[PDB]
Write a protein that binds this ligand. Structure first.
Ligand SMILES: C[C@@H]1CCC[C@@H](C[C@H]2Cc3cc(O)cc(O)c3C(=O)O2)O1
Ligand SMILES: C[C@@H]1CCC[C@@H](C[C@H]2Cc3cc(O)cc(O)c3C(=O)O2)O1
Ligand SMILES: N[C@@H](CCCC[NH3+])C(=O)O
Ligand SMILES: N[C@@H](CCCC[NH3+])C(=O)O
Ligand SMILES: [Cl-]
Ligand SMILES: [Cl-]
Ligand SMILES: [Cl-]
Ligand SMILES: [Cl-]
Ligand SMILES: [Cl-]
Lengths: 472, 476
């Protein structure tokens, strides 16, 4: 046992003493000639007890175990890029003209970043190793590191160094985003950037963040979505367009909500809801196979089968069906509002404030549909116009829209529709752009963080964001 | 020849009349079988007709002409390309509507679907033409507020934003080929560091908390180096709550990377490789022309062939002003001296006149416009300007820093990172989370920032940042 403060204070005095004796504990440059992954790839085939003594290399990394088998034989584990080798430092092999062996190695502690000049071999036990001639401290770790709560979210660097799975999680994340980018680019889509701060915040229903620009003396809204300006680009003649990036919604933090999250929205001119469904099934099934070489995955446990096609459940037909009720249109008539309210009560669930037709329908949809399936993803489709102000009216079903929303394990990860392009039907900047002619178009949104949760077996969004937002 | 409101209001009545006569003017779906680029590629080689092929094609009408009632000529555009629609009474399927009625209805800007056959006279010959989405206004500062108009009317506008995405694509593949790992860091933090700039503030309601939009990505990326991600980067927006002018937009796109075990010399090689390769990739040459002073007056050449000149900020200021600037730079004798030089040359005195801002001002007057024919680096900036850069390995008072300039504008800032936590407190309000991460061991590291919008300005021949942002931030 050691007191952390003593540890820290002592390592601090050590640093100052090195400085004072003229040794620079933070040297500027150490020219490494090979990485640890490279080193392993290149020498893993060596024979037990075989040294290549005439092959000198410079290698770096973080010391993670310190050991000894006497004062003239020190062992360390050295990690870089998520791989590990042994450092076997033997007194006889040490270049004594550069410091007392014992001084130079007593000072090396767990967490230290080091540079090593030495030669590759395997120990007789077969352990792939570097045998120093010289070991340089490049950057000390001044605190004792954990061997094994909230710290993983506040000190993500600690998490990344100690837990192999943490690194796997964020690697998978970037892979997911890479796949998506190439998937859209293969299909002729054009990546763009739209503003994060606008005079209005539209394209979804969510409270916004507000901020103030000093030069223009103006209160701007951080964006809750990217829909409106992307559509303006369709009008502008960019027929396949998308954006991957953050959006901001000013509401509660939970296991599936972070106030900044990463979305992808695309707009596809001359497509419609049917094209969007096909796209969703292709994307998800191909994404999953690309990561796992199979369509069925384990999640915390339950199997999720991503083999297309997926079930499509019509929001009205299904609510009515599981509640032996008819919901007469208009959906915001008093008779249908009262009725919807009755169901809420009849089933003792939380009444939304205020109880508008759109929010009641939404609430009924979360209770009676959204957890219909767990074995596969599925779509809820054909949402009422009152919920869907920017979706186009259904081509055979008055009151409804050509909309879909994909769910995985009761959580929405996708929202898409045929875009309303008739400016007259919309009144009930962007609006001006519609008057110039928005071609028939299909639009689609993904929630990236939520997708990554499922494909890395996490059940908090916090586990797939490097630095999630938290109370200090 | 027409009032815009009449035009608009009339096209509106037309839309309603179509609806009332049972025609849906905004059909849900027209299944096209070929795009315009595809169409061109496939039939460029056809003076002849091929009635041996019936196709469905879409696009926006952009010119309407005629040579008789029975002979109508349109330009149709999609994905940057254009073909002719030659609509001839002969070829029209009269079992689907009066030829003259249909085609009198079609105006400039209309989005249409066409069923016809390919030929040259390079054209599509309709048997039938469907309206898919009308343009209710006659088509021609507006370029910034209605960027859709700009994208449709000016070929160069589309070139500009295509080039922009290409630039970002090249950069992404350039870092990925070299083993770099893309990540996302937060846009809203409890403090905003990594640069000197006023921040935007916003408030989260459920946690009842004030947060700062990020002015840079430096600190959290460095925390990822500590975490063992030795090559890391982020491309994305940052926010600085400052003035707006030809080279400043309050949100702009940057790229920052951190390269463990590299230093300032690695960063210079990287900069030269990146820029020269980027330019050749776009133009098949290293020398490009740029209308600094506007398309009105004469352009200049910019030669991106490496290597680029490196000018040491202290050496050069002293040299062009016959002065010695004794360290410390924030002593009174050296502040007063710097002031007197600003006074003797009638340049604007910064408020307050700190050592760092005076040095900065002297650097913008006497160095930053040294070259115009090539990019160049200003290097080895004083510590007082550079609170996160590491101290120079042989030059007291200075740091291992570089800034690249193109035509007098900074596009790159990079350095060997200060990784000694004891020296940093002394340099520094900035993060304790960050400061704590340093104590766990930041390896020797090189960091670099690019200003993407400003790079794109130079490589698309624009001299306002507003020309390379789709929707720049403006007053209503
Ligand atoms: C833009 C996407 C398209 C798919 C449907 C939803 C999913 C989105 C909802 C959401 C809301 C929120 O307040 C905080 C979040 O973190 C998330 C999220 O992670 O996922 O929005
Ligand atoms: C992160 C980069 C590294 C290179 C140096 C600067 C360039 C950056 C500075 C700037 C500041 C600003 O308030 C508004 C801007 O638009 C820009 C810009 O576009 O250029 O920052
Ligand atoms: N803006 C939508 C995503 C696209 C919906 C289809 N246009 C949302 O945030 O849910
Ligand atoms: N954060 C710097 C970019 C360079 C980073 C070098 N450590 C800036 O905003 O200007
Ligand atoms: Cl249908
Ligand atoms: Cl939700
Ligand atoms: Cl390297
Ligand atoms: Cl050097
Ligand atoms: Cl600047």
């Amino acid at each position: 046992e050691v007191d952390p403060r003593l540890y820290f204070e002592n390592r601090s005095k050590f640093i100052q003493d090195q400085k004072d004796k003229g040794i620079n504990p933070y040297p500027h440059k150490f020219e490494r000639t090979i990485s640890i992954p490279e080193f392993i790839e290149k020498y893993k085939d060596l024979g037990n007890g075989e040294h290549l003594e005439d092959t000198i290399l410079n290698i770096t990394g973080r010391i993670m175990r310190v050991s000894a088998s006497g004062q003239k034989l020190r062992f360390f584990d050295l990690v870089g890029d998520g791989e590990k080798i042994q450092v076997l430092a033997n007194y006889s092999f040490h270049n004594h003209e550069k410091g007392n062996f014992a001084e130079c190695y007593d000072k090396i502690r767990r967490g230290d970043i080091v540079g090593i000049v030495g030669f590759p071999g395997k120990s007789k036990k077969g352990e792939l190793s570097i045998f120093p001639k010289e070991t340089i401290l490049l950057s000390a770790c001044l605190h004792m590191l954990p061997m094994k709560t909230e710290i993983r979210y506040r000190q993500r660097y600690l998490d990344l160094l100690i837990n192999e799975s943490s690194r796997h999680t964020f690697v998978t994340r970037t892979k997911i985003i890479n796949f998506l980018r190439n998937f859209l680019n293969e299909r002729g889509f054009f990546e763009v950037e739209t503003p994060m701060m606008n005079l209005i915040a539209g394209g979804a229903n969510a409270r916004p963040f507000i901020t103030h620009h000093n030069d223009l003396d103006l209160d701007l809204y951080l964006r809750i979505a990217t829909e409106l300006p992307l559509k303006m680009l369709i009008v502008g003649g960019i027929d396949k367009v998308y954006e991957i990036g953050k959006v901001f919604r000013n509401e509660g933090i939970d296991n599936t909500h972070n106030p900044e999250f990463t979305s992808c929205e695309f707009y596809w001119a001359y497509a419609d809801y049917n094209d969007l469904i096909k796209w969703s099934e292709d994307f998800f099934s191909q994404l999953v196979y690309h990561l796992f070489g199979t369509y069925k995955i384990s999640y915390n446990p339950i199997e999720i089968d991503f083999t297309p096609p997926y079930p499509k459940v019509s929001i009205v037909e299904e609510i009515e069906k599981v509640t032996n009720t008819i919901l007469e249109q208009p959906f915001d008539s008093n008779e249908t509002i009262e009725k919807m309210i009755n169901i809420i009560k009849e089933h003792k669930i939380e009444l939304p404030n205020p109880p508008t037709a759109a929010k009641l329908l939404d609430q009924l949809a979360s209770h009676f549909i959204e957890n219909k399936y767990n074995d596969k993803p599925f779509f809820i489709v054909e949402h009422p116009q009152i919920m869907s102000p920017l979706a186009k009216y259904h081509r055979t079903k008055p009151g409804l829209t050509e909309r879909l929303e994909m769910f995985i394990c009761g959580k929405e990860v996708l929202n898409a529709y045929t875009e309303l392009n008739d400016p007259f039907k919309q009144k009930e900047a962007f609006c001006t752009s519609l008057e110039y002619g928005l071609p028939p178009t299909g639009g689609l949104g993904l929630g990236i963080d939520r997708i990554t949760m499922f494909l890395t077996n996490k059940n908090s969004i916090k586990d797939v964001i490097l630095f999630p937002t938290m109370r200090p």
